[PDB]
Design an enzyme around this catalytic site. Structure first.
Site, PDB file in Angstrom:
ATOM      1  N   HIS A  78       0.818  -1.220   0.000  1.00 13.12           N
ATOM      2  CA  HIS A  78       0.000   0.000   0.000  1.00 13.12           C
ATOM      3  C   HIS A  78       0.861   1.285   0.000  1.00 13.12           C
ATOM      4  O   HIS A  78       0.713   2.180   0.834  1.00 13.12           O
ATOM      5  CB  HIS A  78      -1.014  -0.061   1.147  1.00 13.12           C
ATOM      6  CG  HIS A  78      -2.159  -0.970   0.853  1.00 13.12           C
ATOM      7  ND1 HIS A  78      -2.256  -2.219   1.434  1.00 13.12           N
ATOM      8  CD2 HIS A  78      -3.217  -0.784   0.030  1.00 13.12           C
ATOM      9  CE1 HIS A  78      -3.386  -2.742   0.976  1.00 13.12           C
ATOM     10  NE2 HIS A  78      -4.004  -1.910   0.133  1.00 13.12           N
ATOM     11  N   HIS A  82       1.672   1.532  -5.729  1.00  7.36           N
ATOM     12  CA  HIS A  82       0.281   1.094  -5.815  1.00  7.36           C
ATOM     13  C   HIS A  82      -0.582   2.271  -6.274  1.00  7.36           C
ATOM     14  O   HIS A  82      -1.394   2.091  -7.174  1.00  7.36           O
ATOM     15  CB  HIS A  82      -0.197   0.517  -4.481  1.00  7.36           C
ATOM     16  CG  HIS A  82      -1.671   0.243  -4.390  1.00  7.36           C
ATOM     17  ND1 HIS A  82      -2.263  -0.762  -5.122  1.00  7.36           N
ATOM     18  CD2 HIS A  82      -2.607   0.807  -3.597  1.00  7.36           C
ATOM     19  CE1 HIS A  82      -3.532  -0.780  -4.750  1.00  7.36           C
ATOM     20  NE2 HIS A  82      -3.789   0.157  -3.851  1.00  7.36           N
ATOM     21  N   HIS A 116      -6.179   7.413  -3.028  1.00  5.26           N
ATOM     22  CA  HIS A 116      -7.078   6.425  -2.398  1.00  5.26           C
ATOM     23  C   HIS A 116      -6.504   5.651  -1.206  1.00  5.26           C
ATOM     24  O   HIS A 116      -7.294   5.237  -0.364  1.00  5.26           O
ATOM     25  CB  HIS A 116      -7.686   5.457  -3.417  1.00  5.26           C
ATOM     26  CG  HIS A 116      -6.869   4.240  -3.669  1.00  5.26           C
ATOM     27  ND1 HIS A 116      -5.763   4.281  -4.492  1.00  5.26           N
ATOM     28  CD2 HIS A 116      -7.003   2.992  -3.174  1.00  5.26           C
ATOM     29  CE1 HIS A 116      -5.257   3.062  -4.477  1.00  5.26           C
ATOM     30  NE2 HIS A 116      -5.960   2.257  -3.689  1.00  5.26           N
ATOM     31  N   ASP A 117      -5.190   5.413  -1.144  1.00  6.03           N
ATOM     32  CA  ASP A 117      -4.585   4.653  -0.020  1.00  6.03           C
ATOM     33  C   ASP A 117      -3.594   5.492   0.804  1.00  6.03           C
ATOM     34  O   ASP A 117      -2.700   4.942   1.449  1.00  6.03           O
ATOM     35  CB  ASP A 117      -3.922   3.353  -0.518  1.00  6.03           C
ATOM     36  CG  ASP A 117      -4.836   2.139  -0.600  1.00  6.03           C
ATOM     37  OD1 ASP A 117      -5.794   2.056   0.191  1.00  6.03           O
ATOM     38  OD2 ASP A 117      -4.589   1.273  -1.455  1.00  6.03           O
ATOM     39  N   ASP A 227      -8.276  -0.645  -8.290  1.00  7.99           N
ATOM     40  CA  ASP A 227      -7.628  -1.102  -7.071  1.00  7.99           C
ATOM     41  C   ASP A 227      -7.100  -2.543  -7.175  1.00  7.99           C
ATOM     42  O   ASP A 227      -6.065  -2.844  -6.610  1.00  7.99           O
ATOM     43  CB  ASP A 227      -8.608  -0.955  -5.905  1.00  7.99           C
ATOM     44  CG  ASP A 227      -7.975  -0.767  -4.534  1.00  7.99           C
ATOM     45  OD1 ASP A 227      -6.746  -0.502  -4.474  1.00  7.99           O
ATOM     46  OD2 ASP A 227      -8.713  -0.864  -3.522  1.00  7.99           O
ATOM     47  N   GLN A 279      -5.716 -17.434  -3.577  1.00  9.12           N
ATOM     48  CA  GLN A 279      -5.771 -16.602  -4.782  1.00  9.12           C
ATOM     49  C   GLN A 279      -6.869 -17.057  -5.727  1.00  9.12           C
ATOM     50  O   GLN A 279      -7.638 -16.222  -6.205  1.00  9.12           O
ATOM     51  CB  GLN A 279      -4.411 -16.518  -5.489  1.00  9.12           C
ATOM     52  CG  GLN A 279      -3.409 -15.576  -4.794  1.00  9.12           C
ATOM     53  CD  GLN A 279      -3.927 -14.162  -4.642  1.00  9.12           C
ATOM     54  OE1 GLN A 279      -4.498 -13.789  -3.602  1.00  9.12           O
ATOM     55  NE2 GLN A 279      -3.813 -13.366  -5.692  1.00  9.12           N
TER      56      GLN A 279
HETATM   57  C1  LIG Z   1      -6.964 -13.723  -0.664  1.00  7.10           C
HETATM   58  O1  LIG Z   1      -6.412 -12.631  -1.403  1.00  7.10           O
HETATM   59  C2  LIG Z   1      -6.814 -11.365  -1.077  1.00  7.10           C
HETATM   60  C3  LIG Z   1      -7.624 -11.069   0.002  1.00  7.10           C
HETATM   61  C4  LIG Z   1      -7.998  -9.759   0.198  1.00  7.10           C
HETATM   62  F1  LIG Z   1      -8.881  -9.495   1.205  1.00  7.10           F
HETATM   63  C5  LIG Z   1      -7.587  -8.733  -0.578  1.00  7.10           C
HETATM   64  C6  LIG Z   1      -6.742  -8.999  -1.681  1.00  7.10           C
HETATM   65  C7  LIG Z   1      -6.358 -10.337  -1.959  1.00  7.10           C
HETATM   66  N1  LIG Z   1      -5.648 -10.675  -3.097  1.00  7.10           N
HETATM   67  N2  LIG Z   1      -5.330  -9.730  -3.989  1.00  7.10           N
HETATM   68  C8  LIG Z   1      -5.639  -8.459  -3.724  1.00  7.10           C
HETATM   69  C9  LIG Z   1      -6.275  -7.977  -2.566  1.00  7.10           C
HETATM   70  C10 LIG Z   1      -6.276  -6.560  -2.716  1.00  7.10           C
HETATM   71  C11 LIG Z   1      -6.823  -5.472  -1.849  1.00  7.10           C
HETATM   72  C12 LIG Z   1      -7.872  -4.690  -2.330  1.00  7.10           C
HETATM   73  C13 LIG Z   1      -8.397  -3.722  -1.492  1.00  7.10           C
HETATM   74  N3  LIG Z   1      -7.956  -3.489  -0.250  1.00  7.10           N
HETATM   75  C14 LIG Z   1      -6.951  -4.248   0.189  1.00  7.10           C
HETATM   76  C15 LIG Z   1      -6.335  -5.256  -0.545  1.00  7.10           C
HETATM   77  C16 LIG Z   1      -5.205  -6.043   0.067  1.00  7.10           C
HETATM   78  N4  LIG Z   1      -5.727  -6.212  -3.870  1.00  7.10           N
HETATM   79  N5  LIG Z   1      -5.333  -7.366  -4.494  1.00  7.10           N
HETATM   80  C17 LIG Z   1      -4.705  -7.275  -5.808  1.00  7.10           C
HETATM   81 MG   LIG Z   2      -7.464   0.929   0.397  1.00 12.41          MG
HETATM   82 ZN   LIG Z   3      -5.644   0.404  -2.939  1.00 12.05          ZN
END
Ligand SMILES: COc1cc(F)cc2c1nnc1c2c(-c2ccncc2C)nn1C
Ligand SMILES: [Mg+2]
Ligand SMILES: [Zn+2]
EC number: 3.1.4.17
Length: 322
Positions: A78, A82, A116-117, A227, A279
């Site tokens: 983050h 990103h 956004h982050d 995102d 995933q």
């Molecule tokens: C099991 O895998 C995952 C679980 C999960 F809750 C979030 C994510 C995740 N896997 N890929 C992700 C996630 C996010 C994301 C989006 C928005 N806010 C925070 C995050 C971390 N981006 N991407 C590319």
């Molecule tokens: Mg966020």
């Molecule tokens: Zn983000």
């Protein structure tokens, strides 16, 4: 909060993007990864190609970008990288559907994507709420997202960074509200509901882009699609990005272990073997539905779904030993 030096924004003003990137930056699968030094300059380019060379005072814009860079922490995922990845995906979305959006929407959405982050500490909303962090006492729901918007406003309210002052009082209030809604929609918990409402609206043929509520819902899904765009890049880039995402999850889980609390498998460093399966579940439950709905509403967005499907296939191949 934190301000940029005069050296930094002045250097940004001087920057010219190489002609080989001009072509490539228009593509959805474009990886900003190898061009770190150029990232603030890539953003300016995008603002100019989407909104025009004189829709923002060059001086103020450069001070803004550079102060935004400064208020992104050095967390594994983050981070500043990103911010620019998310803004690039929005640029590619806006470009392939230019006249669907207003000049005020295009402006606010690129800025909301870069902010956004803002000031992310590498901890989820669940963490902050469970260990009663001052930020959870301030913002009851969408904790980080309300804080990211607060930081955005605070960077705008800073000496010569207020890139929107030249708009009407009506126009300034609108853009600041487009940004508020855009950053809040990036709270993944809100996405599931939003995605279901849009899917119903599309099926019944009731989705109307002229309806503000419908419009705000479409923007929200664009925010989620941007995102998550790391799932939309070439497999080696996507694989490396997941290592950064999990590095952050494991660091949060480690802070729970230190308090005697067992983290969920996703945040447990001892449970790496479960990552390919995790995933697959995320692509199936979240990413695929998101890009599917975005492609239905905005057909030019289709290459995002195509690449997402390709990366899903790659995770299947990791699970089946191939
Ligand atoms: C099991 O895998 C995952 C679980 C999960 F809750 C979030 C994510 C995740 N896997 N890929 C992700 C996630 C996010 C994301 C989006 C928005 N806010 C925070 C995050 C971390 N981006 N991407 C590319
Ligand atoms: Mg966020
Ligand atoms: Zn983000």
């Amino acid at each position: 909060m934190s301000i940029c030096t005069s050296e930094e924004w002045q250097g940004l003003m001087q920057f010219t993007l190489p002609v080989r990137l001009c072509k490539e930056i228009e593509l959805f699968h474009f990886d900003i990864g190898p061009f770190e030094n150029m990232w603030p300059g890539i953003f300016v380019y995008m603002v100019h190609r989407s909104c025009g060379t004189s829709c923002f005072e060059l001086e103020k814009l450069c001070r803004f970008i550079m102060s935004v860079k400064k208020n992104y922490r050095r967390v594994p995922y983050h981070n500043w990288k990103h911010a620019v990845t998310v803004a690039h995906c929005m640029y590619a979305i806006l470009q392939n559907n230019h006249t669907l959006f207003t000049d005020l929407e295009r402006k606010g959405l690129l800025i909301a994507c870069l902010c956004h982050d803002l000031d992310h500490r590498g901890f989820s909303n669940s963490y902050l709420q469970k260990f009663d962090h001052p930020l959870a006492a301030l913002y009851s729901t969408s904790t980080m997202e309300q804080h990211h918007f607060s930081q955005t406003v605070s960077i705008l309210q800073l000496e010569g960074h207020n890139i929107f002052s030249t708009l009407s009082s009506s126009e300034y209030e609108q853009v600041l509200e487009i940004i508020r809604k855009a950053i809040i929609a990036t709270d993944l918990a809100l996405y599931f509901g939003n995605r279901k409402q849009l899917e119903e609206m599309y099926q019944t043929g009731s989705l109307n882009l002229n309806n503000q509520s419908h419009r705000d819902r479409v923007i929200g899904l664009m925010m989620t699609a941007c995102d998550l765009c790391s799932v939309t890049k070439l497999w080696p880039v996507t694989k490396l990005t997941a290592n950064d995402i999990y590095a952050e999850f494991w660091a949060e889980g480690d802070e729970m272990k230190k308090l005697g609390i067992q983290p969920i498998p996703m945040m447990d460093r001892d449970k790496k073997d479960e990552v390919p399966q995790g995933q697959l579940g995320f692509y199936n439950a979240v990413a695929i539905p998101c890009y599917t709905t975005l492609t239905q509403i905005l057909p030019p967005t289709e290459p995002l779904l195509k690449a997402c499907r390709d990366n899903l296939s790659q995770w299947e191949k990791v699970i089946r030993g191939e």
